[PDB]
């Protein structure tokens, strides 16, 4: 199942809204998760199910679902948020990950 | 096919065999205790009512407090209920035993479904539901046959046999099945209300009414047939068992052969309408039967009419929902239980008013189902012609 | 809190074989599935393998299907992944993760918990 994440790269300042889009060529229901990976560290889960909220993540990281589109939103960009995000599909046995979005400060 | 799965299916087969044991014995209890139709209507529907009431709480207990223990407790209660039905000799005792048996059924079935969902892989969420319906229907058919074949020796042999089978199933469950002892340190707070908030209820109305009509007709037919033939043609319980078992076997063997071939020529909705029309035509003929072999073969030609409907509704549920196999299975099971309640109660209540009144009720219900299918024909035509 | 310890990796001649291990600690193994993923140097992630202990089902990615193998020993709660053929593309940092696989009973039906990798063990590195 092909999965495309946009933009490939994005530059934003402190406190600016950041929006990331992820789209699948086939229906995947709402099993899309969002991960954050630090430089040289194991990826840590951010949002488990579509529009859900994991334990320990600040509420400023939000998810939304609209048909094929899966959107991740960040209201404020703290400098600690500089990392690489990923959208993951797990609707079926096969699992696919997004290209990634390294955010510039 | 490991022993775990075989035991899990046996636990369902015995329990759904326990529903049909009462029916072939009614050629006795109607005259021994001086009971009327309403008494049987309550007595048979008690099992289904208790199972429907206790299924939610039984599933909750199985989830929170383990699955093997709940199944074992349910088997123990089923054996106790069967034995207390056998030993007792009053309407109250039999009523209470039916209630307890329904409780055991409604507390075991969720446990077995959960254990199968645990054992079975993730991609088999559809085939397991097919096995559920297959085993449930096989038990529902082979109930009365075994019950009558054991009732020939004595009034209490079938229930002793059921209790012994329950004890054996409990022994097998203790010795064979196993579930993990550990639990997740920290789960999720979702509590799963999202599915209920993302459902189009209008698209689910037709399959619900179709399966409710099928269940009502199939459950009421046995109760009506037993009393009608014990009065008009005064069958022995052996004859009732022969009729029910032969009809079920013929329906099963024709369903496992002709259903797919019919589907390649007919859509599910139109085929369901035609099957309901065939069933109501045969039930109209049922009234005019005045001899032995005609009313004997009436059941043989009736059971195929509903064995051509049940898989069609199952496939309709599988297709119209999508990836939600669990929700479709839950709705199908709940409405099957509601039909197994609403059938015998009415088929017994209307028997006192007249001998043929429940036949008219079944005919009217089949007509309502077929006209509902015909109404949905316009909706499906509007959907079809508005996109191509 | 729990954490999976990962061992293995090193210099490998192309076309060789290797065994990577992921040992569990403090969490349920029967009610969870172990998944191995990879990260190329300076590139994105892609899920490699998957095993479920309770169901026994195993699956592999279409990019690498049937070449490597996976296994899970429940006696001491460990997961093993075996490489039988290697190439220059396979060099990467491998991570071991867990997703819970257990049903919960809503009234009149069971439902499955969603797919989400909770804990990630520190990844090892494989070269050549």
Automatic annotation (TrEMBL), chain B:
List, alphabetically, the CDD domains matched.
Answer: MFS_MdtG_SLC18_like
State any single GO MF term. xenobiotic transmembrane transporter activity
Q: Which UniProt keywords apply?
A: Cell membrane, Membrane, Transmembrane, Transmembrane helix, Transport
A single GO cellular-component term from the record reads: plasma membrane
Regarding the membrane, this protein is recorded as: Multi-pass membrane protein
Which top-rank group of organisms is this from?
A: Bacteria
Indicate yes or no for the key word Membrane: yes
Please list the residue ranges annotated as the Major facilitator superfamily (MFS) profile domain. Answer: 4-380
Transmembrane ranges? 7-30, 42-62, 69-87, 99-117, 129-151, 157-178, 199-220, 240-259, 271-289, 295-317, 329-351, 357-375
Q: Which PROSITE patterns match?
A: MFS (PS50850)
Subcellular compartments: Cell membrane
Q: What does this protein do?
A: Involved in quinolone resistance. May constitute a membrane-associated active efflux pump of hydrophilic quinolones.
Record-linked PANTHER family: CHLORAMPHENICOL EFFLUX PUMP RV0191, PURINE EFFLUX PUMP PBUE
Put simply, this protein is called Quinolone resistance protein NorA
Query: In the UniProt record, what gene is named as encoding this protein?
Result: norA
């Amino acid at each position: 199942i092909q999965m495309t994440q946009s933009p490939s790269s994005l530059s934003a300042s402190v406190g600016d809204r950041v929006t990331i889009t992820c789209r699948a060529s086939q229906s995947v229901s709402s099993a899309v998760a969002w991960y954050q990976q630090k430089p040289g560290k194991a990826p840590k889960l951010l949002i488990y199910s579509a529009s859900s909220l994991y334990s320990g993540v600040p509420s400023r990281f939000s998810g939304s679902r609209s048909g094929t589109d899966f959107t991740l939103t960040i209201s404020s960009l703290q400098p600690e948020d500089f990392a690489t995000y990923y959208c993951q599909q797990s609707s079926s046995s096969l699992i696919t990950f997004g290209q990634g979005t390294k955010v510039e400060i | 096919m490991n022993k775990q799965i075989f035991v899990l299916y046996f636990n369902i087969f015995l329990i759904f065999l326990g529903i049909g044991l009462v029916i072939p014995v009614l050629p006795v209890y109607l005259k021994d205790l001086g009971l009327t139709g309403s008494d049987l209507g309550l007595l048979v529907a008690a099992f289904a009512l208790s199972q429907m009431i206790i299924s939610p709480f039984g599933g909750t207990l199985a989830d929170k407090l383990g699955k093997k223990l709940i199944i074992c407790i349910g088997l123990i209660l089923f054996s106790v209920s069967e034995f207390m039905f056998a030993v007792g000799h009053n309407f109250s005792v039999l009523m209470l035993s039916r209630v307890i048996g329904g409780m055991s059924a409604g507390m075991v079935m969720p446990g077995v479904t959960g254990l199968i969902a645990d054992i079975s892989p993730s991609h088999q969420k559809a085939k397991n539901f097919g096995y559920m319906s297959a085993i449930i229907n096989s038990g529902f058919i082979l109930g009365p046959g075994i019950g009558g074949f054991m009732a020939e020796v004595s009034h209490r042999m079938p229930f002793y046999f059921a209790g012994a089978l329950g004890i054996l199933a409990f022994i097998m469950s203790i010795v064979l099945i196993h579930d993990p002892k550990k639990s997740t340190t920290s789960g999720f707070q979702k509590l799963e209300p999202q599915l209920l908030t993302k459902i189009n209820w209008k698209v689910f109305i037709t399959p619900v009414i179709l399966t409710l009509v099928l269940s009502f007709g199939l459950s009421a037919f046995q109760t009506l047939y037993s009393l009608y033939t014990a009065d008009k043609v005064n069958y022995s319980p052996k004859d009732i068992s022969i009729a029910i078992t032969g009809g079920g076997i013929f329906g099963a063997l024709f369903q496992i052969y002709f259903f797919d071939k019919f589907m390649k020529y007919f859509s599910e909705l139109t085929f369901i309408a035609w099957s309901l029309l065939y069933s109501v035509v045969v039930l109209i003929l049922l009234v005019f039967a005045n001899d032995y072999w005609s009313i004997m073969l009436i059941s043989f030609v009736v059971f195929i009419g509903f064995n051509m409907i049940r898989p069609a509704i199952t496939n309709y549920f599988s297709n119209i929902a999508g990836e939600r196999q669990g929700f479709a299975g839950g709705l199908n099971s709940t409405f099957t239980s509601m039909g197994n309640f609403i059938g015998p109660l009415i088929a017994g209540a209307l028997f006192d008013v007249h001998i043929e009144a429940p036949i008219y009720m079944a005919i009217g219900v089949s007509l309502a189902g077929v006209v509902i299918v015909l109404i949905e024909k316009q909706h499906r035509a509007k959907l079809k012609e508005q996109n191509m | 809190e729990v954490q999976l310890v990962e061992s293995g990796g090193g210099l490998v001649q192309p076309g060789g074989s290797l065994r990577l291990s992921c040992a569990a600690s403090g969490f349920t193994f029967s009610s969870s599935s172990i998944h191995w993923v990879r990260q190329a140097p300076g590139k994105g992630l892609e899920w490699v393998a998957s095993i479920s202990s309770s169901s026994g089902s195993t699956s592999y990615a279409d990019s690498v299907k049937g070449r490597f193998t996976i296994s899970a020993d429940t006696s001491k709660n460990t997961a093993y992944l075996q490489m039988n053929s290697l190439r220059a593309e396979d060099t990467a940092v491998y991570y071991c993760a867990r997703m819970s696989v257990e049903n919960h009973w809503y009234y009149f039906y069971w439902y499955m918990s969603p797919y989400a990798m909770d804990y990630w063990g520190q990844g090892t590195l494989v070269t050549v």
